[PDB]
């Protein structure tokens, strides 16, 4: 048959099977079709979409780092260096195809259909993430553009989260974590990265008393990542 | 791309865990028609082992979900159709390997060691076809798997030492074939036990430091034997 003759619940069932089979390309294709039907995603559907693309793009980012590390230590052989460079470029082309598809989904469906501030922050953070993934491999003026677009998306998310969400909210915390990584690694601005992460951590530490058992687990999960990053960057 | 560029691409793809790329590169090397070196032979084997292994894993998961699905005919039927897609990919992969074996690798193998290595591989990939086959196809794949393993077994018995890792690996996979495909635990246990005992009797005369690859496989033989007896 095909995705254009399937209803949403069938595509979601397909995504869940693909997830269990670790066929993440299939899972992303199913959730992409769900998103393209134009309706606001449920929490379950948003989880399936995000997990699929995290794994699809994640495999390429990981391959790209491996290939780039090998290029630094490769003997100066013309055939070998041309092979590694065309191989890195192949991976770069796939990564850019993946990220452009996610960013198209975000701008055409996910962000415009978001009816609640928690959803808006989530998708703007996602936009910031996927422009950051482009920035990881970009060069020259294109790098200037993807870096600027990452920063603008994160910043828009950051402003909404400070107005509509408590400092212990997992999405606000996760936004701070990833925006801090962006400043550290992409903008090479470690002081801004450390101050952004420390402020988010401290302000959340200050309000753990307000949380029940379940919320406390959710929040401290990501506060520990913020502490881990601070420890890594300042030791 | 010449052979040197393709082998370098395969090593890069291996490091990047891009095994479909790796298998495509080593397939192209093989189709150039020359006898593979030990290095190229291992790259080809690793690549396709990982390519078919990902599909075997997905197949086992989707099969499991399909079989355990109660009171949901729509999920059950979708699981069936997904399984059949994975089966078709698995059959295409195995077909490619068997074609390389029949056309290039086995006809160019002159040394007993190479013959056994590639006949074992032919047994393995017919075994993987047998994991998903049914009916007359199944009879054909099981018989062809057995034929290849038995041919490799008799060569390795005549021409290779009991501690040779290729001889030990064939005994391991051949015993797995008996256990899992033919449902013959007694044949599987006798094969694994004899290969282990013959290896140990020879290894006792030697310094094991140089036989780390053999002792690893010997441990796998012992592990299967203890699980299968129990």
């Amino acid at each position: 048959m095909g995705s254009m003759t399937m209803d949403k619940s069938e595509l979601v069932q397909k995504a869940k099977l693909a997830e269990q089979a670790e066929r993440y390309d299939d899972m992303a294709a199913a959730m992409k079709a769900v998103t393209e039907q134009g309706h606001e995603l449920s929490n379950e559907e948003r989880n399936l979409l995000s997990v699929a693309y995290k794994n699809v793009v994640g495999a390429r980012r990981s391959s790209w780092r491996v290939i780039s590390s090998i290029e630094q230590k490769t003997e100066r052989n013309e055939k070998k260096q041309q092979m590694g460079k065309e191989y890195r470029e192949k991976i770069e082309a796939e990564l850019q195809d993946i990220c452009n598809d996610v960013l198209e989904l975000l701008d055409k469906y996910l962000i415009p259909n978001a009816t609640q501030p928690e959803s808006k922050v989530f998708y703007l953070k996602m936009k910031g993430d996927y422009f950051r993934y482009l920035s990881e491999v970009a060069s020259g003026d294109n790098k200037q553009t993807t870096v600027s677009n990452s920063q603008q998306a994160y910043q828009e998310a950051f402003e909404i989260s400070k107005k509509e969400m408590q400092p212990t909210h997992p999405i606000r915390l996760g936004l701070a974590l990833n925006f801090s990584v962006f400043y550290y690694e992409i903008l090479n601005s470690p002081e801004k990265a450390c101050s952004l992460a420390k402020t988010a951590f401290d302000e959340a530490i200050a309000e753990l008393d307000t949380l029940n058992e379940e919320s406390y687990k959710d929040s401290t999960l990501i506060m520990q990542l913020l502490r881990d990053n601070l420890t890594l960057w300042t030791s | 791309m010449d052979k040197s560029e393709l082998v370098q691409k395969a090593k890069l793809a291996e490091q990047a865990e891009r095994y479909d790329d790796m298998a495509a590169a080593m397939k192209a090397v093989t189709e150039q028609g020359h006898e593979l070196s030990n290095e190229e032979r291992n790259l080809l084997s690793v690549a396709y082992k990982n390519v078919v292994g990902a599909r075997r894993s997905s197949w086992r998961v989707i099969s499991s979900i399909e079989q355990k699905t109660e009171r949901n005919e729509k999920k059950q039927q979708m699981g069936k159709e997904y399984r059949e897609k994975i089966e078709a990919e698995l059959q295409d992969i195995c077909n490619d390997v068997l074609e390389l074996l029949d056309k290039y690798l086995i006809p160019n193998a002159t040394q007993p060691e190479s013959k056994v290595f590639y006949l074992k591989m032919k047994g393995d990939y017919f075994r993987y076809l047998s994991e998903v086959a049914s009916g007359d196809n199944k009879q054909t794949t099981v018989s062809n798997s057995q034929q290849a393993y038995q041919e490799a077994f008799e060569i390795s018995k005549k021409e290779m030492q009991p501690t040779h890792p290729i001889r030990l690996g064939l005994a391991l996979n051949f015993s797995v074939f008996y256990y899992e495909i033919l449902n013959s635990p007694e044949k599987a246990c006798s094969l694994a036990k004899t290969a282990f005992d013959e290896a140990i009797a020879e290894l006792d005369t030697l310094n094991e430091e140089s036989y780390k690859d053999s002792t690893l496989i010997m441990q796998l033989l012992r592990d299967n034997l203890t699980l299968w007896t129990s």
């Binding site: 989880n47 995000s50 995290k54 989530f122 993430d129 996760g174 | 391991l172 996979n173 796998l220």
Partner: peptide
């Protein structure tokens, strides 16, 4: 049975 630390980023998965 046959023969054979980096900085952190996070994705939020609610429920």
């Amino acid at each position: 049975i046959s023969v054979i630390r980096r900085r952190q980023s996070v994705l939020n998965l609610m429920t």
